[PDB]
């Protein structure tokens, strides 16, 4: 309830004119007050529409000011062009900045003038520095200047923040004012004709610098920001890659004193174990060279902080490192060219000096792993291998990007890259031919996509046809669904938390063992991911083919095999001007159904093969190896105690034993820590990388101005929890500026906190961070009922595509691969399901969402609507709340910190109740009926459809099950058992279980099975209504936790809930 005051001050500051007028609009769920709001509205518009002073009425209608709820504020203000400079000249009295063109290796990666690199606009491209966000730099500057203006009279630590950010913003505004501000077009692009006389990389530098200086709260933050902002203006290729590299060594220097553990059964369990840090001597010399590069690039204060920290190697000063490790990735992306980014990967050194003893074992281990994965389904003759074709055609992801193509649906032309639409096209013209796999050769090389991420290389993406997916689908699904019952993969270690993705950095650590951890992200072009990998899988397929007798399965397996045959020789379309290059690349990357598990397999075989060579010089027992695609760590335990020389020699042996296979590596051995791209542990404490650029994006999505405010707030929340903290007021300023909409050149509307923070399809943020909010009042109920009525909208483009011939044909062809006695129950169902993935096509989503926003605006302008009773969640919570009773409590501190970078209130909760004892309610459609259909088919009929289908007679249900391949005897047994009344109740239990509101970012981490939280929740037991008592206890926990987060103190609760309200609520439970 504070946002709106900052909104008012922002409006007053930005416009400032006599002509700038401000027009509230209100609402109330109470008839009389609502009609008085209507009145107020009318009279205000009239008075505005009559050149009368508006300031007189504002006293008379005090009632609206006290009890009504705000929606929005309108604004009539004229063009007033160029006001940014007219404000900004004062905050720019320092000296501007000069680039240094002789820093980056390439020529165009320097921050030189555009015209020196792009004389013609026809060859200009903003894609090498595109912020890719529908908000301007001028917007960012306006926000910064307003913040600076309002914080112009404070005298505290706040003033030290203001002086620091003022000096930084002076450096920035000095750099911009040297030339001026670029002006956005309607699309938020920056054309050639504005950037012609300015540096090419000024905008990204500006945005990133704003993001950094808005995240300054201390002196060391100021040092970091001044030392990165002045070098990120020139260096754009060797900065985040440089400073983020030493961290991998630093983790091997932090003594553990107190630890968190994880079980095989995936539960945290703290340990007071102490572990030293047996670091060798030569890695310090490496680290010094890295700091020498750091100083040689032009960094002075931040080497000083890393060198004076090593005098003590304490863990209390250590979050600084983590802080630094996050300050590197908030400088922007290194959006270089498709060509040179591919050539970062497409440099190869293949040699006739490697072993053969290694590759043969490698091939065999891959073979064996494949057989372990595939023994059960290949043998027991599973439907999904038999019906692999249909399985892949249902699971066609509708963003999949195979080969842009000119289509026509009746009377249109479409340039879709989506493979579902391509399949719809190819079914009609007789070209659908999944058994005949296309080649990938000179006659048909592959396109590319570009994956950028700061501090690392630009990675590449294959863009394949749609036959390869269909071939790979069934086998890879059985592989995943097997190996998540098994070690060595992220599918087994993943839900949200600690006790997961790693969960065994910290069992097998002491002064007996070590751990070798290794980044393997460059190992895609390597000589060990070519021929042996493919031939190993091919051999395994031969074994598995001889391990079955049915013929569709042999066909599917032979097609997967032939896919690996064709992918063994693979060329790559890349244009360059007029001519087209195609390069020999017979190796592995993503853009495939297979890449994750197969890379994990190959790395597993590789590390298992390497690890049988250290045994020639050491005695150890391998306790654990873990592989998640392109990373790997192995722990190993010894017959004796560890030394510095053994770690060093082991590292050299690892490096040279990879060198024997012509494989580059930075071998890293340690005792307490690891480092990988996204996270790391030091001293038995998990930190994380907070490298999510807010004001600069990777690529250009398809969302609106609106939703980008929500993504930016989500990234803010994440980065804040991770450690990187930005000023929340700035984020709110951006949200209002991005939800602002131009109805004309001079009319502009601004919504309020009570529209953006309400649970709907229009939610953007929350009134109190780290807490979703619900509604006990009339008013949230009112607007939620209103907005739920409006979420359901239409798309004429979708309507005409779904009314064409190819869509009908597609449903029919899907159908005819199965039985032919259901025509109005599933064909409509499959069409309704395909509709859920036609919306991926951007113009459909844009039509629907622009229509949705227009429907919103035609009740933001004029008064509001009651929406006719359509029930939602807050209706229920409104009835649950008035039988609670609070009392002040006092919990002690008995739980350990193991995520230091969190805010102190969240940590205080962790420091008073426990971290996660994880639970499960359903691992997907478990109840009675989908685990039969998923055994005889793959089809996934929606629970709406089942809730209807069970309500029908038992005859056409019997027909429907027989139509899905099932025999008659099991249907007869199902009807005789009388389970349909049970699966009504199980399905409605599953409907209440669909409430996903346990995992938003702060509820993600808290343990609700705690005894300390539970003794506060004194709700007596009634019985025979499990859903209600479940949700009541859950909701009471959420009340306690949210009060704790927002206020720190604790409370107890009590709900002597009447039986009458249990029953009155029971019918609204299992609806909506």
């Amino acid at each position: 309830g504070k946002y709106n005051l900052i909104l008012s001050e922002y409006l007053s500051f930005i416009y400032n004119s006599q002509s700038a007028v401000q027009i509230p609009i209100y609402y109330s769920s109470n008839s009389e007050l609502e009609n008085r709001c209507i009145e107020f509205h009318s009279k205000c518009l009239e008075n505005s529409k009559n050149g009368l002073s508006l300031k007189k009425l504002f006293v008379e209608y005090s009632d609206v000011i006290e009890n009504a709820t705000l929606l929005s504020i309108l604004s009539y203000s004229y063009d007033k062009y160029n006001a940014v400079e007219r404000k900004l000249v004062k905050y720019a009295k320092g000296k501007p900045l000069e680039a240094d063109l002789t820093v980056n290796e390439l020529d165009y990666e320097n921050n030189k003038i555009t015209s020196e690199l792009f004389p013609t606009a026809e060859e200009y491209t903003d894609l090498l520095m595109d912020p890719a966000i529908l908000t301007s730099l001028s917007s960012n500057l306006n926000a910064v200047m307003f913040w600076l203006e309002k914080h112009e009279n404070d005298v505290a630590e706040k003033l030290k923040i203001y002086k620091r950010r003022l000096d930084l913003f002076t450096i920035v505004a000095s750099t911009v004012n040297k030339y001026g501000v670029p002006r956005h077009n309607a699309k938020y692009r920056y054309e050639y004709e504005v950037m012609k006389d300015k540096p090419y990389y000024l905008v990204t530098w500006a945005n990133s610098s704003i993001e950094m200086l808005m995240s300054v709260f201390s002196h060391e933050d100021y040092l970091i920001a001044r030392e990165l902002i002045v070098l990120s203006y020139s260096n754009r290729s060797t900065l985040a890659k440089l400073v983020s590299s030493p961290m991998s060594i630093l983790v091997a220097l932090v003594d553990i004193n107190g630890t968190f553990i994880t079980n095989e059964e995936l539960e945290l369990e703290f340990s007071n174990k102490y572990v030293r840090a047996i670091v060798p001597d030569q890695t310090f010399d490496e680290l010094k060279q890295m700091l020498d590069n750091m100083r040689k690039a032009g960094l002075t204060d931040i080497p000083k902080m890393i060198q004076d920290w090593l005098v003590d190697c304490s863990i209390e000063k250590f979050p600084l490192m983590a802080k630094i490790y996050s300050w590197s990735f908030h400088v922007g992306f290194r959006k270089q060219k498709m060509l040179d980014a591919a050539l970062d990967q497409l440099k190869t050194e293949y040699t006739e000096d490697v072993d053969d003893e290694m590759y043969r074992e490698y091939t065999m281990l891959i073979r064996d792993e494949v057989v372990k994965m595939l023994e059960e389904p290949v043998k027991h003759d599973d439907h999904l291998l038999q019906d692999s074709e249909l399985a892949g055609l249902l699971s066609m992801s509708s963003a999949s990007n195979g080969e842009s193509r000119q289509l026509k649906f009746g009377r249109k032309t479409i340039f879709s890259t989506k493979k579902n639409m391509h399949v719809m096209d190819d079914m009609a013209n007789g070209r659908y031919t999944p058994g005949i796999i296309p080649p990938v050769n000179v006659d048909k090389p592959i396109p590319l996509g570009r994956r950028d991420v700061p501090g690392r290389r630009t990675r590449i993406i294959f863009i394949l046809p749609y036959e390869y997916f269909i071939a790979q689908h069934a086998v890879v699904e059985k592989m995943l669904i097997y190996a998540k019952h098994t070690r060595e993969y992220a599918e087994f270690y993943s839900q949200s938390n600690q006790l997961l993705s790693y969960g065994d950095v910290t069992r097998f650590l002491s002064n007996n063992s070590m751990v070798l951890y290794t980044d393997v992200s460059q190992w895609d072009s390597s000589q060990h991911n070519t021929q042996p990998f493919r031939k190993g899988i091919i051999m395994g397929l031969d074994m598995l083919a001889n391990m079955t007798n049915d013929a569709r399965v042999i066909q599917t397996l032979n097609l997967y095999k032939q896919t690996q045959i064709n992918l063994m020789d693979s060329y790559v379309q890349i244009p360059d001007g007029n001519v087209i290059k195609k390069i020999q690349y017979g190796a592995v990357a993503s853009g495939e159904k297979q890449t994750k598990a197969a890379n994990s397999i190959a790395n597993l075989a590789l590390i298992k093969t390497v690890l049988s060579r250290i045994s020639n010089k050491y005695s150890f027992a391998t306790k654990i190896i873990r592989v998640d695609g392109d990373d790997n760590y192995a722990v190993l335990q010894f017959n004796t105690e560890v030394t510095k020389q053994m770690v060093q020699d082991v590292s050299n042996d690892v490096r040279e034993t990879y060198a024997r296979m012509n494989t580059k590596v930075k071998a890293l051995v340690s005792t307490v820590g690891i480092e990988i791209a996204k996270r790391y542990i030091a001293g038995g404490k998990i930190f994380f990388r907070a490298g999510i650029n807010l004001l600069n994006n990777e690529k250009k999505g398809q969302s609106t101005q609106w939703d980008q405010a929500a993504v930016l707030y989500s990234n803010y929340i994440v980065n804040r929890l991770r450690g990187f903290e930005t000023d929340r007021e700035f984020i709110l300023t951006k949200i209002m500026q991005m939800t602002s909409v131009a109805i004309t050149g001079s009319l502009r509307l601004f919504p309020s906190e009570r529209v953006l923070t309400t649970n709907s399809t229009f939610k953007v943020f929350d009134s109190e961070d780290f807490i979703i909010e619900y509604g006990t009042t009339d008013d949230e109920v009112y607007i939620q009922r209103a907005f739920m009525s409006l979420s359901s909208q239409k798309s004429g483009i979708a309507d005409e595509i779904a009314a064409s011939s190819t869509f009908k044909n597609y449903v029919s062809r899907l159908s005819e691969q199965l039985l032919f006695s259901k025509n109005n129950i599933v064909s409509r169902g499959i069409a309704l399901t395909e509709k859920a993935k036609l919306n991926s096509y951007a113009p459909i989503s844009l039509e629907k969402r622009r229509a949705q926003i227009s429907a919103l605006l035609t009740m933001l302008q004029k008064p509001v609507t009651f929406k006719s009773s359509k029930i939602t969640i807050n209706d229920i919570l409104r009835d649950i709340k008035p039988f609670f009773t609070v009392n002040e409590a006092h919990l002690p501190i008995q739980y350990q910190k193991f995520m230091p970078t969190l805010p102190d209130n969240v940590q205080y909760i962790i420091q008073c109740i426990g971290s996660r004892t994880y639970q499960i309610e359903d691992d997907g459609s478990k109840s009675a009926i989908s685990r039969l259909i998923s055994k005889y088919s793959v089809y996934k009929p929606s629970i709406e459809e089942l809730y209807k289908v069970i309500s029908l007679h038992e005859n056409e249900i019997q027909l429907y099950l027989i139509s899905l391949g099932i025999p008659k005897i099991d249907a007869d047994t199902y009807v005789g058992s009388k389970i349909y009344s049970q699966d009504k109740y199980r399905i409605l239990e599953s409907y209440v279980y669909n409430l996903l509101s346990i995992n938003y970012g702060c509820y993600q981490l808290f343990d609700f099975n705690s005894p300390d939280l539970e003794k506060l929740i004194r709700i007596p037991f009634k019985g025979k209504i499990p859903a209600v008592t479940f949700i009541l206890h859950l909701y009471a926990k959420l009340e306690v936790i949210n009060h704790a987060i927002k206020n720190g103190s604790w409370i107890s609760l009590f709900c002597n809930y009447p039986k009458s309200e249990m029953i009155k609520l029971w019918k609204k439970m299992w609806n909506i």
Binding site: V442, V579, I580, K582, Q584
Partner: peptide, 7 residues
Amino acid sequence: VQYEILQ
């Protein structure tokens, strides 16, 4: 229409 080759 035009192409280039590498091996």
